[PDB]
Amino acid sequence: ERQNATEIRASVGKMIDGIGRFYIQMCTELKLSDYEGRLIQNSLTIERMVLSAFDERRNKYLEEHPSAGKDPKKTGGPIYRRVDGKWRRELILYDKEEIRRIWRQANNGDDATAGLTHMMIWHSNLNDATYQRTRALVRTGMDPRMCSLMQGSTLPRRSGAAGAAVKGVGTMVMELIRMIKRGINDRNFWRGENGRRTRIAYERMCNILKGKFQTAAQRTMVDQVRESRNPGNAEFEDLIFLARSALILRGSVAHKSCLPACVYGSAVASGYDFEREGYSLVGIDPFRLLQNSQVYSLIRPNENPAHKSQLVWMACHSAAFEDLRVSSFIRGTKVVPRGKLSTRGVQIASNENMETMESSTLELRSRYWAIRTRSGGNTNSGQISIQPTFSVQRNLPFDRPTIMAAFTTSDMRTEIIRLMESARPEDVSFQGRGVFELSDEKATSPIVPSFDMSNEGSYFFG
Amino acid sequence: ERQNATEIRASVGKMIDGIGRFYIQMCTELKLSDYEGRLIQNSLTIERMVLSAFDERRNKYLEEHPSAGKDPKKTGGPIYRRVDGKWRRELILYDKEEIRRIWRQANNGDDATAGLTHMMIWHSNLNDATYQRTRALVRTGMDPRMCSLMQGSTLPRRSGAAGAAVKGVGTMVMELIRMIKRGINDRNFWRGENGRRTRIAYERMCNILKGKFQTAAQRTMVDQVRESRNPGNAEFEDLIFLARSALILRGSVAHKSCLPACVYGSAVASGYDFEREGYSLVGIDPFRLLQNSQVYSLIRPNENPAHKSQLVWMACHSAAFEDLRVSSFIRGTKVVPRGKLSTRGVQIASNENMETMESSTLELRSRYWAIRTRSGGNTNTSDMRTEIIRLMESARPEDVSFQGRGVFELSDEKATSPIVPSFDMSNEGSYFFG
Amino acid sequence: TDGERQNATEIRASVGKMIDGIGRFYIQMCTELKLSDYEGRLIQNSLTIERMVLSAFDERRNKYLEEHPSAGKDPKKTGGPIYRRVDGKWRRELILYDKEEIRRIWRQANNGDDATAGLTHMMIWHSNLNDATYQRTRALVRTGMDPRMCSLMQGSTLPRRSGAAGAAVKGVGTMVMELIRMIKRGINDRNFWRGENGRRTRIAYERMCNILKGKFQTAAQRTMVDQVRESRNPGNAEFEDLIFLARSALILRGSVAHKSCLPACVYGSAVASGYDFEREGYSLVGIDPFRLLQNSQVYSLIRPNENPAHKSQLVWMACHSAAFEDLRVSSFIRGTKVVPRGKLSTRGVQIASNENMETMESSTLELRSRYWAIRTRSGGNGQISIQPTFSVQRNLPFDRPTIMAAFMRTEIIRLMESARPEDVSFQGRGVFELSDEKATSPIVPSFEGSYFFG
Amino acid sequence: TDGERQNATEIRASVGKMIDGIGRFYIQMCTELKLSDYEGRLIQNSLTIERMVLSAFDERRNKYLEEHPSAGKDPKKTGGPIYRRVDGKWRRELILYDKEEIRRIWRQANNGDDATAGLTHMMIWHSNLNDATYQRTRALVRTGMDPRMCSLMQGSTLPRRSGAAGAAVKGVGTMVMELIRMIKRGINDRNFWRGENGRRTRIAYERMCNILKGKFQTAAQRTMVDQVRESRNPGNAEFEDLIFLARSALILRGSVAHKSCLPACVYGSAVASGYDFEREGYSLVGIDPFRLLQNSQVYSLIRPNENPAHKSQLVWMACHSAAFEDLRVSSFIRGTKVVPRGKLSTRGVQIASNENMETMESSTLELRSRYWAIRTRSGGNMRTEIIRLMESARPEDVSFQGRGVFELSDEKATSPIVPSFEGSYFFG
RNA sequence: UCUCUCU
RNA sequence: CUCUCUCUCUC
RNA sequence: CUCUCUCUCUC
RNA sequence: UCUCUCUCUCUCUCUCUC
RNA sequence: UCUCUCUCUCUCUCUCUC
RNA sequence: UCUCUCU
Numbered sequence A: 001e002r003q004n005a006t007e008i009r010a011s012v013g014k015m016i017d018g019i020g021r022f023y024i025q026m027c028t029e030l031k032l033s034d035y036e037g038r039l040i041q042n043s044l045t046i047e048r049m050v051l052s053a054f055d056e057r058r059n060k061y062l063e064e065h066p067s068a069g070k071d072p073k074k075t076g077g078p079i080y081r082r083v084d085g086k087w088r089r090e091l092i093l094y095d096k097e098e099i100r101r102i103w104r105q106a107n108n109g110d111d112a113t114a115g116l117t118h119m120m121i122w123h124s125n126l127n128d129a130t131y132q133r134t135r136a137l138v139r140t141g142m143d144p145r146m147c148s149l150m151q152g153s154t155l156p157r158r159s160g161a162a163g164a165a166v167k168g169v170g171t172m173v174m175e176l177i178r179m180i181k182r183g184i185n186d187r188n189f190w191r192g193e194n195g196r197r198t199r200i201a202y203e204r205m206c207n208i209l210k211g212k213f214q215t216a217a218q219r220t221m222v223d224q225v226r227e228s229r230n231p232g233n234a235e236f237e238d239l240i241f242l243a244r245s246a247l248i249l250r251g252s253v254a255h256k257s258c259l260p261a262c263v264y265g266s267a268v269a270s271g272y273d274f275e276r277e278g279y280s281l282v283g284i285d286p287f288r289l290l291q292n293s294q295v296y297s298l299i300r301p302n303e304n305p306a307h308k309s310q311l312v313w314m315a316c317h318s319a320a321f322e323d324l325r326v327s328s329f330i331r332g333t334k335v336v337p338r339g340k341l342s343t344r345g346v347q348i349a350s351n352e353n354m355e356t357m358e359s360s361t362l363e364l365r366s367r368y369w370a371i372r373t374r375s376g377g378n379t380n381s382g383q384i385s386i387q388p389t390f391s392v393q394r395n396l397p398f399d400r401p402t403i404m405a406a407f408t409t410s411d412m413r414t415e416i417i418r419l420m421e422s423a424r425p426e427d428v429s430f431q432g433r434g435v436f437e438l439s440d441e442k443a444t445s446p447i448v449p450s451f452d453m454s455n456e457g458s459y460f461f462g
Numbered sequence B: 001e002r003q004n005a006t007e008i009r010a011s012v013g014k015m016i017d018g019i020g021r022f023y024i025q026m027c028t029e030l031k032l033s034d035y036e037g038r039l040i041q042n043s044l045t046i047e048r049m050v051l052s053a054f055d056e057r058r059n060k061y062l063e064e065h066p067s068a069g070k071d072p073k074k075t076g077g078p079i080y081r082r083v084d085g086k087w088r089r090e091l092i093l094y095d096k097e098e099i100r101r102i103w104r105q106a107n108n109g110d111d112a113t114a115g116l117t118h119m120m121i122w123h124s125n126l127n128d129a130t131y132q133r134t135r136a137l138v139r140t141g142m143d144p145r146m147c148s149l150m151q152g153s154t155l156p157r158r159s160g161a162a163g164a165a166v167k168g169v170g171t172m173v174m175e176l177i178r179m180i181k182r183g184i185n186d187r188n189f190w191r192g193e194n195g196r197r198t199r200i201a202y203e204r205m206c207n208i209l210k211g212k213f214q215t216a217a218q219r220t221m222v223d224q225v226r227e228s229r230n231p232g233n234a235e236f237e238d239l240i241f242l243a244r245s246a247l248i249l250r251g252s253v254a255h256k257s258c259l260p261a262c263v264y265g266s267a268v269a270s271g272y273d274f275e276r277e278g279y280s281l282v283g284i285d286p287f288r289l290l291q292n293s294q295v296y297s298l299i300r301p302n303e304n305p306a307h308k309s310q311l312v313w314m315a316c317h318s319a320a321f322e323d324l325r326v327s328s329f330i331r332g333t334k335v336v337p338r339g340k341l342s343t344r345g346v347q348i349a350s351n352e353n354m355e356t357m358e359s360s361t362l363e364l365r366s367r368y369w370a371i372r373t374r375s376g377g378n379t380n381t382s383d384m385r386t387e388i389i390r391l392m393e394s395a396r397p398e399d400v401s402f403q404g405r406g407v408f409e410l411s412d413e414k415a416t417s418p419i420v421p422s423f424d425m426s427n428e429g430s431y432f433f434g
Numbered sequence C: 001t002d003g004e005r006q007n008a009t010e011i012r013a014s015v016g017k018m019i020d021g022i023g024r025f026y027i028q029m030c031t032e033l034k035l036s037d038y039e040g041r042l043i044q045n046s047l048t049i050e051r052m053v054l055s056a057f058d059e060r061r062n063k064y065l066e067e068h069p070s071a072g073k074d075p076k077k078t079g080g081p082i083y084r085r086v087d088g089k090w091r092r093e094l095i096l097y098d099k100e101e102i103r104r105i106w107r108q109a110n111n112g113d114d115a116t117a118g119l120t121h122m123m124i125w126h127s128n129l130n131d132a133t134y135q136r137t138r139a140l141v142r143t144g145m146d147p148r149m150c151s152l153m154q155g156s157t158l159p160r161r162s163g164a165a166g167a168a169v170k171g172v173g174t175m176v177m178e179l180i181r182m183i184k185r186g187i188n189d190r191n192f193w194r195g196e197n198g199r200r201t202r203i204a205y206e207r208m209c210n211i212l213k214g215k216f217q218t219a220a221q222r223t224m225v226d227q228v229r230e231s232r233n234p235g236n237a238e239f240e241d242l243i244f245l246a247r248s249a250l251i252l253r254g255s256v257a258h259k260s261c262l263p264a265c266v267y268g269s270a271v272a273s274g275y276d277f278e279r280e281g282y283s284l285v286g287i288d289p290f291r292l293l294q295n296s297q298v299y300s301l302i303r304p305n306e307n308p309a310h311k312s313q314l315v316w317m318a319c320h321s322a323a324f325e326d327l328r329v330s331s332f333i334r335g336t337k338v339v340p341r342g343k344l345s346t347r348g349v350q351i352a353s354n355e356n357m358e359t360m361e362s363s364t365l366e367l368r369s370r371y372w373a374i375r376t377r378s379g380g381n382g383q384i385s386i387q388p389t390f391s392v393q394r395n396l397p398f399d400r401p402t403i404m405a406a407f408m409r410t411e412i413i414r415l416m417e418s419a420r421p422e423d424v425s426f427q428g429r430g431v432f433e434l435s436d437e438k439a440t441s442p443i444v445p446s447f448e449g450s451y452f453f454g
Numbered sequence D: 001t002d003g004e005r006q007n008a009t010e011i012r013a014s015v016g017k018m019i020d021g022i023g024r025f026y027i028q029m030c031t032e033l034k035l036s037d038y039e040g041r042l043i044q045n046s047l048t049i050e051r052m053v054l055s056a057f058d059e060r061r062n063k064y065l066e067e068h069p070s071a072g073k074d075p076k077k078t079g080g081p082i083y084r085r086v087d088g089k090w091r092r093e094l095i096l097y098d099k100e101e102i103r104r105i106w107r108q109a110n111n112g113d114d115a116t117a118g119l120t121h122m123m124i125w126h127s128n129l130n131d132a133t134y135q136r137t138r139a140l141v142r143t144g145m146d147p148r149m150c151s152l153m154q155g156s157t158l159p160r161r162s163g164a165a166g167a168a169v170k171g172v173g174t175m176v177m178e179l180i181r182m183i184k185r186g187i188n189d190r191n192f193w194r195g196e197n198g199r200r201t202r203i204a205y206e207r208m209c210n211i212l213k214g215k216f217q218t219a220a221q222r223t224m225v226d227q228v229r230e231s232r233n234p235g236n237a238e239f240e241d242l243i244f245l246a247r248s249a250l251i252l253r254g255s256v257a258h259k260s261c262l263p264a265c266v267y268g269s270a271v272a273s274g275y276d277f278e279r280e281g282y283s284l285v286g287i288d289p290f291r292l293l294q295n296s297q298v299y300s301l302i303r304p305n306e307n308p309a310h311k312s313q314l315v316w317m318a319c320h321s322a323a324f325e326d327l328r329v330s331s332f333i334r335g336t337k338v339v340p341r342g343k344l345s346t347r348g349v350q351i352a353s354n355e356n357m358e359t360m361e362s363s364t365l366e367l368r369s370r371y372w373a374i375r376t377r378s379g380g381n382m383r384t385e386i387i388r389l390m391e392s393a394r395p396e397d398v399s400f401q402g403r404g405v406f407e408l409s410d411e412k413a414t415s416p417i418v419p420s421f422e423g424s425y426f427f428g
Numbered sequence E, J: 001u002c003u004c005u006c007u
Numbered sequence F, G: 001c002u003c004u005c006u007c008u009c010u011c
Numbered sequence H, I: 001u002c003u004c005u006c007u008c009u010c011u012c013u014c015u016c017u018c
């Protein structure tokens, strides 16, 4: 049981080491200095170069249908250099085959797609913490208020099962609803070989959505949605109902700390063997890495570097939809809602005035650290029954409804509504779990927060 | 009929006396004082030394494949000494042959494996009362909520039939499911001489599981599981069904009070001849031994000694999965569920700060005493799943089992006048792990 | 139909997969025993290889051998006579193989599964060869049965390990002999039918009575078997009653399945030739065995002063399980006259240890038939109601006496007296040509002896 | 076949276990009677030991001896003449033994099992010896049968305790004589065939008639024996047809099983040599008895003026039950001419009390045969039809066509040696 | 000269 | 019937 | 309901 | 000669470049 | 992508009283 | 790891 855990840690560390040494090689090939190599924007550009080089289907499409005034075999992006204290942007072009060769040499001749998926999740978390997706929500017919379920909405299809665990209930519902809308518009959807392929995709997406849900009624309803040969308006409405139900009876969304490649590259250049030490995306390793890492960023004139650092921290730990109170408790500084952040996105546009732009250090440090969870809370585990030890008269208790429900009407909407009506926004989940100090590597002594003072806000996008 | 009972008591007392005099000899050889000899952690270390010395197969494997920076012929453990009121831990190493010689001399030149199995059951009960096994449950595909059937999950294979009676339905189902999973992955399982041996093991484990069950339908279903030449997914699912059915139509799991060796050693040094008086693991003897025994333990800073004492009491009487109401009635103090116990495990890790650690006396005393039972209560065509489901559907969590049986006062040695509890006041919790 | 095509296709693939395993296993064993093409195609060598497999998977006998080992023979090794041709002369050397080694080789050939269907297929092939070669009248008399009912002795040498598949191919006479031996042991041993074992024997007795009952066709015969089954302590009354049942089967023949189980050498040669039985499928009652034998060349050991054609006819008879079939029909299908057993100038196929393996020569077996027919699981030899479709005032007729009619020994005797040895059975069904793979145009024959064992 | 190989191997082990018990028990009794190697190999000693065991397990006679004790003999002790050679000369002393002690020794030698097969095997050996030595025309004349059918008296001395196995080896004449005694008892006693005991007698009469019917071969003989069985009150008429059936057996011979039951001394010697009959197996109709006798040395007590060769021939014939066989075939198998009974200069093997055990010397028995053959349970090939059948029968029809005699070195019986053939009647 | 409803 | 039966008796 | 039951593999 | 109350780590691979 | 009125002209079976 | 057409 311990051996499997140590191999898992070694494999994750291998992925991290590959990403870091690729970043070091890219910094060497780009002639970036230490400061320029630690800039988050340069790392964003380099990661996007990697992702676009290995986007096989898009590359093939670009070869078949060339873009306007662009070579389909070259990637690029903005690389920022400091000359005499002034920042300037450059568009430098790299062959896709060269990028692929460098990445494979970084991973010891292997095209490790796990690191690519890691960078993809990092970008998705950053986009989730920065930009809202209300327009896409409204277009598909879902309420703009279920933004908390839209984690991982920018993750592309090539992420696969690794990225599927990260995307929330809202994004899966949105994709299924898009499929149903396409089927409603054109009946030739779900017909032909493409029809068989899209039916398989629909079944697989419904199955992973079902795995996301926790209560039996939600699983039964998504099962009923999956069983329809030609899903129409009814299944789209049922999906919307399930998405709204996910606000109270939450789902199992996997949260991982995917740091920018600059941190990994600095760690690998420092001499940290992730293969020997081991890495975990849900434990203390990202926190320990972020505490002793220095990252720089570009601050547009009249912006608050503290707000940008908070945004990057939230993106790194995928805490965009987290309660502001617990996020502030872990960070030690107030996590300000999105409305009151005097900052724009991390990425710099091509039309910006690259003469008033400044540079600031990012405060990616937290007082406490906590375990990142897949669970969405308790829906209402333990000991169901008693095993008698003493020969005493006594009633022998057991949880009869829970035992029987595994051994047994067809309208589960009423049951779901009843379950959500029973719930109150005051129940305590994750009982007995707390936040650990940075020195508590083994997570032995937890600290439970007491939020029973004057009330701060709780929703980042509120 | 009485003569056989008195010989059984004499044999059990012989085992207890051997364990106690071994503990006395070990305390003499370790230069432990009385307080240090009564510490539960030192007794845990000594018992683990005994078990590792006599773990023949592991010792042979260690000789063939040496461990990293360890002598395969030496056992050890943390021994705690008090100097100027400050506790300090020491790692002292003892030859395995020396430990075996001392143990055999304790049992009069005999390698009494019964005492080793007794210590094994004590450790298993402590682990059951302290640590939950939900990860192993989920890995094997069983619900994490059938923890009440996982009694004796940490018992090693060398316990045999004595330890097999103690392990519950959940652990046996889990082991059978592991075997089925191994067979599913590799077809060379159940083939060859190893295949014949593992088929024999599977049949024996199925037979003792069948003996565990009470109703005829459960026995028929486990019989059908046993009869399959190549058990696959269907038998694993049927085993899961039987495990879930065991929550309502419970099984026959044997409960024994296996005390730490410190209590036995103190009793033997006091002058209690277990051979002449006789010992029973299901009667008043463990209660009477625990009432007049003093045990010390190490309390980490910011812990409740009452909660640790309750944990040790539950471990001693194997009441981990017991109803909290009856356990509190027998103890006289509220048995708090695991979630609200402000205490960690008994054992101290090697990385702990051995300068803020304190010592506390363990309150292993109960107001009443009760007989420990093997029974799981009263239970009242070729597809017996439907029949089992019907039987469980008939049952309600209000039926009274063990009718006419009560808890006896400590002075009632012969168990003559029972006391029946009336739990008909405001409801406390009932599940320890809830 | 139109739904049983799928089921027919499923069965063909499953049998083809079994045939593939036998061929794949034979090829592996041939390369491991170091046998050339000629020796690989020898029927005697294939017999030894097949018997080695059957003994390696005999769990019960192997256990008994371990507990009570024989003298000089360890119960973990099997083997048999392997015949090799060196310098033109033939020599026999006894090969010893570990049963675990043979079991692993067989399992590896069938993709790691036990595949007892392949073993039962080989056991049926041995039973067919035994039936066509040797006549067991001594067992018939020893059990008290009349030695004249040799036509019902189909599969009398099949071991009990062949259940279902073996039981379907075995005949009424063999089934009755099994019942009689159970009865005799009960009469001799009073403990029989009593105790824990008596319960096991009773269930075994019930099961084989039911399968025997399903073998019969007339209602009178089935009712007679049903009575015998009910007897809690069977004795002489059931002994005589079953004897009457066997005698009745000569006229009111039961349903005995007939399958063409070929030697493993034929399958091995076919599989080595790239032939894929699993893909195109197979059938033991269709044209597949006939087409395989046409293209297959098999050699055998011929003892001095033995007609090679007569041995080839014996192997041909065993291949198609036509030992008890009419000589005229067998002669028509083969194209060359089939001779009775008394006029066959040959001994058994299997060569004995005490035989001088120096005057022995090998010959090719002529296992080719001019025609091909479908093997039958049947023996020899209207509307009574109405279902209205229109709403009219008519009266719905039914044959009342016949419907209520279906709600011993004199009746059976009356049935056989009416029967005569001239009734035409299988009316309109004939024999096809090898080029006619779809059974489109039957060729009805027009027909001096007709008894092989006469 | 190919399925009866397992059955044959199973039967061989069961017979070998019986012989092992016989050999093991003899070894113990020799060690417990304190018999030397020479005395243990004496055929007279082996018979005495065998007779002690058979009487020790005779429940009915033992019960009658208890209820009605004999004069000077307690019914709980058995024994016989044991011949011991010390100082060159032979002497006989009666040994007395508890029947229960003998029973325990026999049972312990058979792993605690009764092993009634071994006792019957010894009983068949004694019958074979009696048949070759003594001719019982007195019983034939007393029962009303013509004394000329002495060829059908095979196993006439076998006790009724040997059921199944005993009945298989006994002949038509013995079966007829048993029935004739039943008829004579019924005719004399009117209460016979009536009452509770009459029912028991009727079932015995039916069962022994059934085995006689199975002993016959021609359909005519079976039907007539079927008629005799159906008689509820058999009398003189059933007397006659049984006599006629016996006379027909001289021409239309029945199927009588022939087994080679050797003396216990041979088995004891073989077991002491380490031979494991259970492992190697045994058979009473195959080569095993012949191969055992070739390597076995046994001695006998010779009365003065007696030819050792004739006594050895008598033992050889009794061993293989060739008392009523053709002398030419017996001579061909043995290799030395077999002499008829009238020309044998020897008396019975057993020595009587009234015989002076002082002029008696011992000789080695030549129980070795040049050839070996397989013992047969078969013969060769209303009432007017029966007489018609035996009229067509001639004493020249060849039987067992193509079946011959093999060599001791040919253990698989691969190459038969067909004989080509002046008397042929032992009792003639 | 003993004790017990209900593996 | 070239081997394929025998666990005993009107006990 | 106590007791001997002894362990497929170090796990 | 080890540690732990209370499944969340890991391979899952992509209907279409979107 | 077959054929047939009217008793099996094709529909196995995943081995044994282990 | 045996042998046999046909009491």
Ligand SMILES: *[C][C]([O])[C]O[C][C][C][N]C(=O)C1=[C]C(C2=C3[C]=[C]C(=O)[C]C3=OC3=C2[C]=[C]C(=O)[C]3)=C(C([O])=O)[C]=[C]1
Binding pocket: A190, A191, A192, A193, A195, A196, A197, A199, A200
């Ligand atoms: C079990 C499972 O596998 C099941 O699944 C189901 C689903 C899938 N499918 C799909 O996708 C498809 C199909 C199809 C078809 C159809 C449809 C409908 C109806 O009704 C009919 C049909 O038919 C058919 C098909 C296919 C093929 C064939 O052959 C036939 C489609 C079309 O058609 O196009 C598509 C898709």
Ligand SMILES: *[C][C]([O])[C]O[C][C][C][N]C(=O)C1=[C]C(C2=C3[C]=[C]C(=O)[C]C3=OC3=C2[C]=[C]C(=O)[C]3)=C(C([O])=O)[C]=[C]1
Binding pocket: B190, B191, B192, B193, B195, B196, B199, B200, C056, C057, C058, C059, C062, C063, C099, C103, C114, C116, I018
């Ligand atoms: C009564 C009782 O005893 C029964 O039991 C049963 C079970 C046991 N077994 C086991 O475990 C085993 C077996 C085996 C075998 C087999 C299998 C399967 C089949 O099919 C066949 C067979 O065969 C055999 C065997 C063994 C031995 C011999 O000889 C043969 C195994 C293997 O094989 O490996 C294992 C186990």
Ligand SMILES: *[C][C]([O])[C]O[C][C][C][N]C(=O)C1=[C]C(C2=C3[C]=[C]C(=O)[C]C3=OC3=C2[C]=[C]C(=O)[C]3)=C(C([O])=O)[C]=[C]1
Binding pocket: B001, B002, E001, E002
């Ligand atoms: C065998 C059967 O029957 C069962 O048994 C048991 C029960 C009944 N009982 C009897 O029988 C007996 C008993 C006894 C006893 C007694 C007697 C008398 C008196 O008084 C007392 C007593 O005690 C006792 C007993 C037993 C046991 C115990 O524990 C006690 C006897 C004697 O003793 O002897 C006999 C018989």
Ligand SMILES: *[C][C]([O])[C]O[C][C][C][N]C(=O)C1=[C]C(C2=C3[C]=[C]C(=O)[C]C3=OC3=C2[C]=[C]C(=O)[C]3)=C(C([O])=O)[C]=[C]1
Binding pocket: A001, A002, B058, G010, G011, H001, H002
């Ligand atoms: C299989 C089942 O039973 C589970 O398993 C796990 C848990 C329990 N345990 C066991 O069994 C074992 C352990 C071990 C170990 C040890 C021992 C001793 C000492 O001292 C130390 C140690 O350490 C460790 C281990 C394991 C793992 C880790 O990680 C650490 C063993 C050895 O070592 O051999 C065996 C068994």
